[PDB]
């Protein structure tokens, strides 16, 4: 439905990157699936995937102390707990469900920083995603740059790797945790969730970055049958551009028509 996505692009003065995979049949929908976009906060879902490979459920109860030096531009949860700290579990919850930036950075430091995250992503077969920076500097991507970018195809592949039993890069109890957090996300109601059919469940992670970049990646489940994994990425021509979540919801509707 290439002309359908081109028409949407034009309506929102934007560029789309789309990949969706029905995991039951391998039917795919693609539109610029290999084009780089700033991944923005979608990287938080993969960072937690790596945290979960490396830590036991019990070890997620370790309390992490931090200070106001760890606070960055957007700290909705972490700003409330400077005095006591937060557990790794609580930081993952804040990162995934509120897109708390300091939470992502603390988790990233626990796993060894952006170079360690990159190594672990390469180990699962993601040759594309390029972690380089912490939040919020990772949102400052000029189009054409490869630092802190990925593609729709690569983000779907990696998200599927952590979240689903096939290929299963997490054990079951840990998969369940990641899915539960993503299902309870608070930031995505106007994105992929707004473009799926009645009765579909959604586990998503959003992001927004320079050049009006607006992304959502998700696992979606029909009332019965196999899940779809999809990424809807977008950006715009001008550095200070705004975004419109409706572009992602409408692109999701086109994907769903194509799949069903």
């Amino acid at each position, epitope marked *: 439905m290439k002309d359908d996505f081109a028409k949407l692009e034009e309506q929102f003065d934007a560029k789309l990157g789309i990949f969706a995979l029905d995991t039951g049949t391998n039917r795919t929908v693609a539109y610029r699936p290999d084009e780089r976009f700033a991944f923005a906060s979608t990287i938080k879902a993969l960072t937690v995937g790596v945290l979960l490979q490396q830590k036991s459920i019990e070890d997620l109860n370790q309390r992490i102390t931090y200070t106001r030096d760890d606070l960055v531009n957007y700290n909705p949860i972490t700003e409330k707990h400077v005095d006591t700290g937060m557990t790794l579990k609580e930081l993952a919850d804040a990162s995934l469900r509120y897109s708390d930036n300091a939470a992502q950075n603390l988790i990233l*430091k626990q796993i060894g*920083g952006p170079e360690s995250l990159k190594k672990e992503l390469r180990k699962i077969g993601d040759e594309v995603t390029n972690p380089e920076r912490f939040e919020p500097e990772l949102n400052e991507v000029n189009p054409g740059e490869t630092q802190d970018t990925s593609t729709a195809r690569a983000l779907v592949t990696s998200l599927r790797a952590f979240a689903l039993e096939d290929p299963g890069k997490l054990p079951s109890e840990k998969r369940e945790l990641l899915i539960d957090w993503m299902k309870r996300n608070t930031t995505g109601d106007a994105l992929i969730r707004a473009g799926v059919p009645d009765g579909w469940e959604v586990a998503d992670k959003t992001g927004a970055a320079s050049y009006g970049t607006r992304n959502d990646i998700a696992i979606i489940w029909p009332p019965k049958g196999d899940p779809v994994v999809l990424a809807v990425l977008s950006s715009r021509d001008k550095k200070d551009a705004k975004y419109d979540d409706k572009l992602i919801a409408e692109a999701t509707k086109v994907v769903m028509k194509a799949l069903n």
Partner: nanobody
Amino acid sequence: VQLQESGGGLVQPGGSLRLSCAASGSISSITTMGWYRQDGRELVALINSVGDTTYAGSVKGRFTISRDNAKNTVYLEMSSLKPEDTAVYYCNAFMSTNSGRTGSFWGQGTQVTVSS
């Protein structure tokens, strides 16, 4: 556990400095250690326990971070300093202690002033 900084001060444009940051106390392990500055707030350089480095785009090729795991100490060598590098630089280490505490710890900050 604490972080001790040293090495700041005033230098002329073009000059150089080395900052050091040493962790002390009952330390079990350290993941990332490195340097931030406030002009706003930005990472300057980070190095992990297996020697992987991250540098701010504006300093790469001029500043070198290194680490001595055995001594829990990180060093930031700064060369070809510019007036735009004038800032408070402050050290961060993500550490675990033998008492079972883990967290992001910070040094006191060190002024570097670059001026004729």
